[PDB]
Scaffold this motif. Structure first.
Motif, PDB file in Angstrom:
ATOM      1  N   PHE A 260       1.069  -1.338   0.072  1.00 54.64           N
ATOM      2  CA  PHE A 260      -0.006  -0.141   0.072  1.00 54.64           C
ATOM      3  C   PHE A 260       0.732   1.319  -0.362  1.00 54.64           C
ATOM      4  O   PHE A 260       1.939   0.735   0.690  1.00 54.64           O
ATOM      5  CB  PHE A 260      -0.886  -0.144   0.876  1.00 54.64           C
ATOM      6  N   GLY A 261      -0.147   2.378  -0.865  1.00 52.58           N
ATOM      7  CA  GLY A 261       1.081   3.218  -1.048  1.00 52.58           C
ATOM      8  C   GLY A 261       1.852   4.120  -2.521  1.00 52.58           C
ATOM      9  O   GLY A 261       3.108   3.899  -1.635  1.00 52.58           O
ATOM     10  N   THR A 262       1.661   3.460  -2.776  1.00 52.15           N
ATOM     11  CA  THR A 262       2.468   3.445  -4.473  1.00 52.15           C
ATOM     12  C   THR A 262       1.823   3.548  -5.551  1.00 52.15           C
ATOM     13  O   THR A 262       0.153   3.522  -5.580  1.00 52.15           O
ATOM     14  CB  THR A 262       3.637   1.586  -4.617  1.00 52.15           C
ATOM     15  N   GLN A 263       1.740   3.284  -6.623  1.00 52.61           N
ATOM     16  CA  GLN A 263       0.951   3.235  -7.640  1.00 52.61           C
ATOM     17  C   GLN A 263       0.628   1.741  -8.646  1.00 52.61           C
ATOM     18  O   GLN A 263      -0.690   2.147  -8.632  1.00 52.61           O
ATOM     19  CB  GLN A 263       2.285   4.020  -9.044  1.00 52.61           C
ATOM     20  N   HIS A 264       1.787   0.899  -8.192  1.00 48.16           N
ATOM     21  CA  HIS A 264       1.242  -0.406  -8.678  1.00 48.16           C
ATOM     22  C   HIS A 264      -0.537  -1.110  -8.274  1.00 48.16           C
ATOM     23  O   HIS A 264      -0.861  -1.858  -8.529  1.00 48.16           O
ATOM     24  CB  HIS A 264       1.874  -1.522  -7.581  1.00 48.16           C
ATOM     25  N   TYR A 265      -0.509  -0.255  -6.656  1.00 47.76           N
ATOM     26  CA  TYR A 265      -1.225  -1.010  -6.045  1.00 47.76           C
ATOM     27  C   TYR A 265      -2.990   0.422  -6.759  1.00 47.76           C
ATOM     28  O   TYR A 265      -3.074  -0.615  -6.899  1.00 47.76           O
ATOM     29  CB  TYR A 265      -1.815  -0.332  -4.188  1.00 47.76           C
ATOM     30  N   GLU A 266      -2.230   1.116  -7.423  1.00 48.24           N
ATOM     31  CA  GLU A 266      -3.495   2.275  -7.613  1.00 48.24           C
ATOM     32  C   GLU A 266      -3.399   1.883  -9.306  1.00 48.24           C
ATOM     33  O   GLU A 266      -4.567   2.083  -9.774  1.00 48.24           O
ATOM     34  CB  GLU A 266      -2.651   3.887  -8.120  1.00 48.24           C
ATOM     35  N   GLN A 267      -2.899   0.977 -10.317  1.00 49.18           N
ATOM     36  CA  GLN A 267      -2.911   0.674 -11.055  1.00 49.18           C
ATOM     37  C   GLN A 267      -3.854  -0.957 -11.143  1.00 49.18           C
ATOM     38  O   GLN A 267      -4.594  -0.826 -12.020  1.00 49.18           O
ATOM     39  CB  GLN A 267      -0.788   0.643 -11.919  1.00 49.18           C
ATOM     40  N   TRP A 268      -3.284  -1.707 -10.137  1.00 48.94           N
ATOM     41  CA  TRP A 268      -4.492  -2.647 -10.582  1.00 48.94           C
ATOM     42  C   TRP A 268      -5.701  -1.921  -9.798  1.00 48.94           C
ATOM     43  O   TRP A 268      -6.857  -2.973 -10.336  1.00 48.94           O
ATOM     44  CB  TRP A 268      -3.724  -3.445  -8.858  1.00 48.94           C
ATOM     45  N   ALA A 269      -6.315  -1.059  -9.115  1.00 47.88           N
ATOM     46  CA  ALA A 269      -6.868  -0.455  -8.303  1.00 47.88           C
ATOM     47  C   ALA A 269      -7.907   0.465 -10.589  1.00 47.88           C
ATOM     48  O   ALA A 269      -8.990  -0.902 -10.169  1.00 47.88           O
ATOM     49  CB  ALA A 269      -7.188   0.753  -8.057  1.00 47.88           C
ATOM     50  N   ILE A 270      -7.406   0.442 -10.489  1.00 42.01           N
ATOM     51  CA  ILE A 270      -7.519   1.253 -12.011  1.00 42.01           C
ATOM     52  C   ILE A 270      -7.884  -0.169 -12.939  1.00 42.01           C
ATOM     53  O   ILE A 270      -8.711  -0.069 -13.559  1.00 42.01           O
ATOM     54  CB  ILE A 270      -6.696   2.177 -12.476  1.00 42.01           C
ATOM     55  N   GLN A 271      -7.220  -0.641 -12.999  1.00 40.97           N
ATOM     56  CA  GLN A 271      -7.273  -2.528 -13.759  1.00 40.97           C
ATOM     57  C   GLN A 271      -8.972  -2.828 -12.877  1.00 40.97           C
ATOM     58  O   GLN A 271      -9.692  -3.615 -14.680  1.00 40.97           O
ATOM     59  CB  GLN A 271      -6.242  -3.028 -13.743  1.00 40.97           C
ATOM     60  N   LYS A 275     -11.636  -3.746 -15.801  1.00 41.58           N
ATOM     61  CA  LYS A 275     -12.473  -5.241 -15.208  1.00 41.58           C
ATOM     62  C   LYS A 275     -14.393  -4.836 -15.312  1.00 41.58           C
ATOM     63  O   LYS A 275     -15.068  -5.876 -15.805  1.00 41.58           O
ATOM     64  CB  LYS A 275     -11.583  -6.477 -14.696  1.00 41.58           C
ATOM     65  N   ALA A 276     -14.199  -4.253 -14.708  1.00 46.19           N
ATOM     66  CA  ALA A 276     -15.864  -4.557 -14.140  1.00 46.19           C
ATOM     67  C   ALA A 276     -16.982  -3.296 -15.024  1.00 46.19           C
ATOM     68  O   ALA A 276     -17.601  -3.647 -14.322  1.00 46.19           O
ATOM     69  CB  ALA A 276     -15.466  -3.783 -12.688  1.00 46.19           C
TER      70      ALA A 276
END
Ligand SMILES: [Zn+2]
Length: 660
Positions: A260-271, A275-276
RNA sequence: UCCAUGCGCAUGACG
RNA sequence: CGUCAUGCGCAUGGA
């Protein structure tokens, strides 16, 4: 009007020699440039030939500055001058100031648009053959798909047609002058990579040599006092939020697959949101959006007072409740999420006041220098805008020394904030120059004609070699206090800037000392290569958009996978914006407005667009960025963020439908 | 002077 | 290729 060191570097340019020039800050390169101009024109008088000079930039402000300060005061008498822009409402078009006005200062895309009008038949056209000389500032942008590389690709295509005729049997072409600071190195860890870069630049400019100064380095060093490269480098509230995050992760089975606290989490969130949206299911993209907000809060909390994140999210959910009430004027999902927030809202506000920071070391260094200097000039750099506003308000909260400061950001209306104004940028700049503003807070907008300064800091920042030297250029007055503030490889990056500045000279000295034949061969090869690149790129682009379908689809909302519009019910205005009249649509949307173009919101609460006023009509304009597609041919949903992505075409609006 | 919008460009970091 | 942040230019419509 001639300097010694400037003399030799000008010397080749006076007779052919389409070249490059690169010199540091403060060397008055404008002046030598003007000398080349005047001398070129006087030669054309001696030959009675078409003396036309056009000056290209990247920004409007330099055009205005040079029109005020450099070209008129040395050519206001002899020759015609005019300083142009995209905003200066000109009474005539460009081809007339081509038909007149020996001297032009202008932005590039003005010219490029005129060339497109030429090769399109649009408005009277213009070509390079109308010139005898071109002059450029900041060559180092001259790369793939840059602002003005297109001009040079045209120039090169014409040069190669000239070669083809020459061997075949040759229309003239203008001399080209290029100026810059350090011409920058791009994507290098190698001298060979950098050499390839420079050679690509020169071939993109069709240059002969760089012609840097070597002879009179001492007289120039006497002018430039240089700054000193320096390093001055230096919870549970957060953890409660991380626990909330984990709670929500459990609430909808979200596998972060990272920290938590980075882009990769943000990237996965947007992805996940993507998907949804491909699914049209809730609990999945909604959670992506919320967790995106939470990750914003995190990675500001890593650098920012937690009160600011509390304000961020307070305003966020405030707007959310406003949306849902204006619509209702609820689901287990949104209910859960709201109550999960608000059950901790006031208590987290209470936690927000508690101390325990980079901010502390920062204030310490700040107060140290403002006590040292005692006329003191200060600049702050950082990444983001909201950072600047937060720190300004924060230091306004903190007492004190009495130093006065102010923020600064760019102009792009994107991604968080109502942008600043060029007038207001100039204004704040004049306030700083006055001494009314002691300390500036800026993004990369500063890396301009800012006053001589001392303590340009780097609070949580990374910059590249060109940015490093441009930050160097403004710090003057025999006092440099370069400072750097990051947490946990940022020394590495200033070290990289030093290393690259070394590599640049190491490359320059190799290429200056190169065969003319092999140099010309490689530059010709790179020119042909880039031309083939642009040709294939245009080929693929033309092949891209070919559908132009009138109506094939259904537009749905994205929170709820509810029908909103059809393929045909949409119409187009300004050949920019889209609208759905036919008030069968109008039975759907809801309107919102607080603080003249009111905004639209869904029957769930999803925001959709703006009520844009056009020709009296109050047309509901919508943004594809907040909608989802269902093609008739293809069931799977898609999402583009821009109409232009969609090749299929919609009609221009006809007012004959809407009378009475 | 302000507002809204569209489009294109570059840069850094990230995958 | 995508994401984010930053900065830039141009074209619009309106006030
Ligand atoms: Zn909805």
């Amino acid at each position: 009007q001639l300097r010694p060191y400037q003399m030799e570097v000008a010397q080749p340019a006076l007779d052919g020699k389409n070249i490059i020039i690169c010199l540091p800050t403060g060397s008055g390169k404008t002046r030598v440039a003007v000398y080349i101009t005047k001398d070129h024109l006087d030669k054309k008088k001696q030959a009675s030939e078409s003396g036309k000079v056009i000056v290209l930039v990247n920004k409007v402000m330099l055009a205005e500055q040079l029109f005020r300060k450099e070209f008129n005061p040395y050519l206001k008498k002899w020759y015609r001058i005019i300083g142009l822009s995209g905003d200066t409402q000109l009474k005539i078009s460009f081809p007339e100031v081509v038909k007149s006005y020996d001297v032009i200062i202008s932005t590039a895309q003005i010219l490029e648009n005129s060339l497109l009008n030429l090769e399109s038949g649009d408005d009277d056209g213009v070509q390079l053959s109308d010139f005898s000389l071109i002059i450029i500032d900041e060559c180092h942008h001259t790369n793939k798909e840059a602002v003005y590389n297109n001009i040079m690709r045209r120039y090169l295509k014409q040069k190669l047609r000239n070669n083809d005729l020459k061997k075949q049997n040759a229309i003239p072409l203008p001399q080209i002058l290029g100026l810059t600071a350090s011409p920058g190195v791009g994507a290098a860890k190698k001298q060979s990579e950098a050499e390839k870069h420079i050679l690509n630049i020169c071939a993109n400019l069709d240059a002969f040599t760089i012609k840097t100064v070597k002879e009179n380095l001492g007289q120039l060093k006497h002018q430039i006092k240089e700054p000193c490269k320096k390093f001055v480098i230096a919870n549970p509230f957060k953890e409660k939020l991380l626990e909330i995050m984990a709670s929500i992760q459990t609430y909808c089975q979200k596998s972060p697959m990272s920290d938590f606290g980075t882009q990769h989490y943000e990237q996965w969130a947007i992805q996940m949101e993507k998907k949804a949206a491909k699914d049209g299911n809730r609990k999945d993209r909604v959670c992506a959006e919320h967790l995106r907000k939470y990750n914003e809060a995190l990675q500001i909390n890593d650098t920012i007072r937690m009160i600011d994140a509390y304000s961020h999210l307070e305003t966020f959910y405030t707007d959310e409740k406003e949306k849902k009430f204006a619509v209702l004027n609820l689901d287990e999902t949104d209910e859960f999420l709201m109550n999960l927030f608000f059950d901790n809202k006031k208590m987290l506000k209470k936690l927000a006041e508690n101390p325990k920071e980079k901010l502390i070391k920062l204030r310490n260094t700040i107060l140290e220098q403002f006590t040292r200097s005692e006329s003191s000039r200060g600049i702050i750099f950082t990444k983001t805008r909201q950072s600047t506003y937060a720190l300004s308000q924060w230091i306004m909260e903190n007492a004190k020394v009495g130093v006065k400061a102010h923020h600064l950001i760019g102009a792009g209306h994107s991604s968080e904030v109502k942008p600043m104004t060029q007038t207001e940028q100039k204004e704040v700049i004049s306030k700083f120059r006055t001494g009314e503003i002691n300390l500036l807070i800026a993004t990369t907008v500063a890396e301009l004609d800012i006053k001589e300064c001392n303590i340009v800091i780097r609070y949580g920042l990374v910059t590249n070699e060109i940015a490093m030297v441009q930050a160097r250029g403004r710090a003057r007055a025999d006092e440099s206090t370069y400072v750097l503030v990051t947490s946990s490889g940022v020394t590495e990056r200033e070290i990289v800037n030093d290393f690259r500045e070394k590599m640049m000279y190491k490359a320059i000295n190799r290429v200056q000392n190169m065969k003319p034949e092999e140099y010309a061969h490689k530059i010709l090869e790179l020119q042909v290569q880039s031309i083939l690149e642009k040709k294939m790129k245009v080929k693929r682009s033309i092949a891209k958009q070919y559908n132009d379908n009138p109506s094939l689809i259904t537009l749905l909302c994205k929170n709820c996978s509810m029908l909103v519009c059809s393929g045909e019910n949409i119409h187009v205005i300004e050949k920019m914006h889209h609208v759905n009249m036919t008030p069968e649509f109008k039975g759907l949307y809801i309107v919102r407005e607080n603080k003249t173009n009111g905004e639209i919101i869904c029957k769930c609460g999803q925001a959709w667009g703006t009520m844009m006023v056009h020709k009296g009509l109050d047309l509901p304009c919508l943004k594809i960025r907040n909608f989802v597609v269902n093609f008739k041919n293809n069931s799977p949903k898609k999402q583009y963020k821009k109409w232009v992505e969609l090749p299929i075409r919609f009609p221009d609006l006809d007012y004959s439908e809407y009378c009475l």
